[PDB]
Amino acid sequence: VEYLQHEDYLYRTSKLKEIRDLGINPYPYQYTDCLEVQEIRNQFVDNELGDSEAAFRKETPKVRFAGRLVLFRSMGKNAFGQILDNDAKIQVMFNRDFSAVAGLAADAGISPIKFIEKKLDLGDILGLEGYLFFTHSGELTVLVETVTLLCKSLISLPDKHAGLADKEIRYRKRWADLISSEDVRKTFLTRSRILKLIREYMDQQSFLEVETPILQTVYGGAEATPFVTTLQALHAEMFLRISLEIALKKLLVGGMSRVYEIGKVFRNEGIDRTHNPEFTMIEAYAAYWDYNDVMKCVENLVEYIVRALNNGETQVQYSHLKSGPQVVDFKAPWIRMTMKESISVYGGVDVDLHADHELRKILETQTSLPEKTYVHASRGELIALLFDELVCDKLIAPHHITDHPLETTPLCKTLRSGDETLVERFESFCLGKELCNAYSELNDPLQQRKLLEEQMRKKALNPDSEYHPIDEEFLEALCQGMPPAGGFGIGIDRLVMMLTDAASIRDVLFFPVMRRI
Amino acid sequence: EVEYLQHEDYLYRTSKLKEIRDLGINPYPYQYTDCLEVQEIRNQFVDNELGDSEAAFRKETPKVRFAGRLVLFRSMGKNAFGQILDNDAKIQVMFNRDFSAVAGLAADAGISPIKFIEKKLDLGDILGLEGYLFFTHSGELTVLVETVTLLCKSLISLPDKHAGLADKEIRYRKRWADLISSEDVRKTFLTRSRILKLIREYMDQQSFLEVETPILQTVYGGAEATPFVTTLQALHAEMFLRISLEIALKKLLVGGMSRVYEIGKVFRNEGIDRTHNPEFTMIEAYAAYWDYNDVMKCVENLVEYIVRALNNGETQVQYSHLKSGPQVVDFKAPWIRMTMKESISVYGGVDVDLHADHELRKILETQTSLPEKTYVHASRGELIALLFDELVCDKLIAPHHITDHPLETTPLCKTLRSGDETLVERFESFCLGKELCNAYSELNDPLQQRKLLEEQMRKKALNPDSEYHPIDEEFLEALCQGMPPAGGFGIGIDRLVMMLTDAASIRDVLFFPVMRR
Numbered sequence A: 001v002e003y004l005q006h007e008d009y010l011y012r013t014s015k016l017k018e019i020r021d022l023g024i025n026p027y028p029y030q031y032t033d034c035l036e037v038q039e040i041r042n043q044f045v046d047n048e049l050g051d052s053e054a055a056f057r058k059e060t061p062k063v064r065f066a067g068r069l070v071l072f073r074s075m076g077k078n079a080f081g082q083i084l085d086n087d088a089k090i091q092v093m094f095n096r097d098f099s100a101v102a103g104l105a106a107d108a109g110i111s112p113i114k115f116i117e118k119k120l121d122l123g124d125i126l127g128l129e130g131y132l133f134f135t136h137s138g139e140l141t142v143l144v145e146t147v148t149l150l151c152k153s154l155i156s157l158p159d160k161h162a163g164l165a166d167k168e169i170r171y172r173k174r175w176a177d178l179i180s181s182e183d184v185r186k187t188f189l190t191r192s193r194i195l196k197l198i199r200e201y202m203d204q205q206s207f208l209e210v211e212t213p214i215l216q217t218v219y220g221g222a223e224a225t226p227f228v229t230t231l232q233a234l235h236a237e238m239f240l241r242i243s244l245e246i247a248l249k250k251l252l253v254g255g256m257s258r259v260y261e262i263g264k265v266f267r268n269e270g271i272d273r274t275h276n277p278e279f280t281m282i283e284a285y286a287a288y289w290d291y292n293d294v295m296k297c298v299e300n301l302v303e304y305i306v307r308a309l310n311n312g313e314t315q316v317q318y319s320h321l322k323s324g325p326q327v328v329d330f331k332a333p334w335i336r337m338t339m340k341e342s343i344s345v346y347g348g349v350d351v352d353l354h355a356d357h358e359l360r361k362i363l364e365t366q367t368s369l370p371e372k373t374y375v376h377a378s379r380g381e382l383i384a385l386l387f388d389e390l391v392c393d394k395l396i397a398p399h400h401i402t403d404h405p406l407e408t409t410p411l412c413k414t415l416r417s418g419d420e421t422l423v424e425r426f427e428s429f430c431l432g433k434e435l436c437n438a439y440s441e442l443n444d445p446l447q448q449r450k451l452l453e454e455q456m457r458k459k460a461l462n463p464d465s466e467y468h469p470i471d472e473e474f475l476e477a478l479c480q481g482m483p484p485a486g487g488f489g490i491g492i493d494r495l496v497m498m499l500t501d502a503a504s505i506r507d508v509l510f511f512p513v514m515r516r517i
Numbered sequence B: 001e002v003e004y005l006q007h008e009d010y011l012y013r014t015s016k017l018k019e020i021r022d023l024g025i026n027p028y029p030y031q032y033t034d035c036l037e038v039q040e041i042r043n044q045f046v047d048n049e050l051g052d053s054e055a056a057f058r059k060e061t062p063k064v065r066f067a068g069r070l071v072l073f074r075s076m077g078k079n080a081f082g083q084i085l086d087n088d089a090k091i092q093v094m095f096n097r098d099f100s101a102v103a104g105l106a107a108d109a110g111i112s113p114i115k116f117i118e119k120k121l122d123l124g125d126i127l128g129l130e131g132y133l134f135f136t137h138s139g140e141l142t143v144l145v146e147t148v149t150l151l152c153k154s155l156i157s158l159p160d161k162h163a164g165l166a167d168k169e170i171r172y173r174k175r176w177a178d179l180i181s182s183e184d185v186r187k188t189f190l191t192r193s194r195i196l197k198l199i200r201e202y203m204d205q206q207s208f209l210e211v212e213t214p215i216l217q218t219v220y221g222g223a224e225a226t227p228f229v230t231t232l233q234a235l236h237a238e239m240f241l242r243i244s245l246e247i248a249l250k251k252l253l254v255g256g257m258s259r260v261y262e263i264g265k266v267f268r269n270e271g272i273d274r275t276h277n278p279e280f281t282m283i284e285a286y287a288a289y290w291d292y293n294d295v296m297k298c299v300e301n302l303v304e305y306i307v308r309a310l311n312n313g314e315t316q317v318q319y320s321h322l323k324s325g326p327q328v329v330d331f332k333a334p335w336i337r338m339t340m341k342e343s344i345s346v347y348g349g350v351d352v353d354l355h356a357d358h359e360l361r362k363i364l365e366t367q368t369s370l371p372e373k374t375y376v377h378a379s380r381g382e383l384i385a386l387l388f389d390e391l392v393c394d395k396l397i398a399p400h401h402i403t404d405h406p407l408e409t410t411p412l413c414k415t416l417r418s419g420d421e422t423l424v425e426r427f428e429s430f431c432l433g434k435e436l437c438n439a440y441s442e443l444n445d446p447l448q449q450r451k452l453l454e455e456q457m458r459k460k461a462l463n464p465d466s467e468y469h470p471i472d473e474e475f476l477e478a479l480c481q482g483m484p485p486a487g488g489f490g491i492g493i494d495r496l497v498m499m500l501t502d503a504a505s506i507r508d509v510l511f512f513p514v515m516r517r
């Protein structure tokens, strides 16, 4: 903790005894009956309003507000400052004869203007009561009648313009980002706005929002390494959920026809520009829908969010791809292709012309996959691998990629046409990244067992594979009966990244996962 | 050992699968389109002139499409009558040998539509129904079914209507069965979702920004609890699951965010009972420039708003499960407000400030069951908190704010503005004998905060049941940057849901509470 020895800390802390000896509490209890700076600007900026002399004569509107002192200049009889309040700034003016310090007696040893000069500091949080006016240059300003010290800050303001090291530190010390950077402030406001837009759209579709456990005795609904923890009351290993799917499907068996949940899931994997081990996703299930109904719902949801954030526009610019800035159009309907078509269109491989061995030669010679990944892969697995290596990077515009091999998931019905090698699944891609996963949901309880047992026997032969056993409570609930349903999941942090031009998932998380010092 | 897979009725129902399929009917079809909710059918047509059964046979009444679970069925010769359950609403259905068709059943098939409905369908199956509305002689809204579609063949039967203690205890695990068979359980969980939407609506209208902060952290704090511990593979690092929301949100206030709240799960690795589940939902909210008196008004206004919105503008609520018998509690604001010392006098019979510590001890010895270890060396403030715990808390049935706690009860709270540094500007809200809310005039003096956390370390160092817990240094640095004066509260939302749904146990307001082996 190197700041405890910095000059500025020792200098500021020594002002505490000085301020308290003047009978002033440097950490008081409240600052009631005030207005937000932005609300003052909203009410009075576009207004006929007086000059400094009208404020000196107490003729202009009186206001109370509070915030952080981020600029100060003494001009003798007068001093000027800037107050930052919740992403808004306003100028303040102190005058030797007009301005008082709350708590500073008239017979104290120091004048108000010198108290302001010498006992306050940049970074201190002040309560300001005074009179509005406009400078002739047009700057909205407050002539301060009383300044109240609300918090004596003990370290200096952050460097406003962060170098690379400061930017890394501020992923932990996020308060320094929020004080310093209008852009970080907008990014997180937009994130909150996006969450409200999602809830509003879902609720207008009569989806009910629910909560289901993060700590479970099993984990499933996705392919991921889990987090493990011990519950002391039962002396039991628990897993943190990796998805929402199984719990929500039980609520369908329970009779709820439309449910969704927005919550954290945990995948104990690597960390990079698109991967934080703790992330936020929505899963939503609608009885009597299929993946086609889900496809219209997902693209309409996103278009609606984009239109609400961009004054009706559906085009959005994203600046940080290795290939340069791109403009992506979220206007529905999005591009729709089967996995097989996308491999043909973007990979240059018409898959159904090549035997399994030819598909391995393509993977072996045209990709950098290790031999163990394809040498014994089934035809469907080979097709999915071709998609991963030859297609996924190329899907910059929004795409729905449909009709995946059966091997990709055990929880999805096969194509209603009768092709049992493909499922009624789509994944949505934008900016080279997966955004959405969606199924015509499997509710045949015998078929569901068959697929999960198949998945367990296949996994049990891979050394690096996670042994989780069959969820029998899930199978029993399907025996009770799940309606036909369509479901989807959306990685919300990734979506926020697309709609805020964030280079990394760390820019949309207040406190992302960081290495220890 | 899965028991239903060996039960006669499982064999009985699975047998129908091949039979139905040999009729060319898919027992798990892909969708049921243009499907209305039953509740939406009732909303248009119950308060409505509607024909009788003969007008429905004439196809002259409104035609509807809907879906749900067959839960009652009685054949009456050429007619049969049933009840469909769709998402907490029920509607009666009528089949008729001449009027009703089974989707996908051929005329040249060897079974009639009515016999199919009798022989191949079961209570539990999920059906799609299209037909004409009418009123029975007794006034019941009914649908004469033109076409029934098998939407899901159920392989076990409806849950038994008479559940014992053990039959109901299995249903806390097998919650889908509870939801199917209990209207009280269905309504409890619908009320829970409404409560969550109402909390958000209220906080959003007070201009709080909703945020998310991490569950997985390198530290834990903001409450007294045993944490859950897990391992983050990518960093080979031990992590804690958050026990509260407080530290992360206070950092956001330092960042200049004036009003934030979060609704999410916290994890306390404690014992389980009617008011404790190791994973539970809370809201924390912080407002710059407020104190605990502002927070107190905010809390009671929020809860009164929720109660009023859920009970047609009433503020009184019935709760049935206290030992004292069925009560009625009024959530109308302002709630009863007392200091902890007043409450020990009013409800406990002890004027604490007329007693020495050793006399506070004698009281705890003779008038409670506390182990001598709990109080033999406790400080005066600690003695007073135990006197409250043992003599007052159970008696607070009507909503109370209990203010001005001993400093020992928390390290994160400012002391009384009167100058009494043995008490802090904290309140807890109680209702039905249970803590509901915890709130501070938040501590933002960095040196005082460090002092209080150090004294906690020394106190905890003497307990061999508490492992060593370092001081959150980044938190202290954020306070050094400067936190405004602030008021914050936390509310246990599950306990809140319990008090408004007449739930005996927290297990009743969670879909999947923690359960023994």
Ligand SMILES: O=C(NCC1(O)CCC(F)(F)CC1)c1cc(=O)c2cc(F)ccc2o1
Pocket: A224, A267, A268, A269, A270, A274, A275, A276, A277, A278, A279, A281, A282, A434, A435, A436, A437, A488, A489, A490, A491, A492, A493, A494, A505
């Ligand atoms: O948004 C993400 N993925 C896209 C989805 O797969 C999310 C789940 C779905 F919403 F259901 C379908 C779309 C995402 C973000 C992460 O931070 C992350 C971290 C990991 F360790 C592992 C996977 C991760 O995945």
Ligand SMILES: O=C(NCC1(O)CCC(F)(F)CC1)c1cc(=O)c2cc(F)ccc2o1
Pocket: B225, B268, B269, B270, B271, B275, B276, B277, B278, B279, B280, B282, B283, B435, B436, B437, B438, B489, B490, B491, B492, B493, B494, B495, B506
């Ligand atoms: O609602 C609860 N308590 C009330 C509060 O203390 C919650 C925190 C606050 F919201 F900040 C102020 C009010 C509650 C519910 C549990 O299931 C639970 C489980 C545990 F293992 C330990 C404590 C628990 O506490």
Ligand SMILES: N[C@@H](CCCC[NH3+])C(=O)O
Pocket: A221, A222, A242, A243, A244, A245, A283, A437, A438, A439, A441, A487, A488, A489
């Ligand atoms: N559980 C899926 C999301 C929903 C897929 C459709 N049921 C996942 O995590 O990928």
Ligand SMILES: N[C@@H](CCCC[NH3+])C(=O)O
Pocket: B222, B223, B243, B244, B245, B246, B284, B438, B439, B440, B442, B488, B489, B490
């Ligand atoms: N974090 C607190 C609630 C907020 C108290 C006021 N800052 C708790 O868990 O009890």
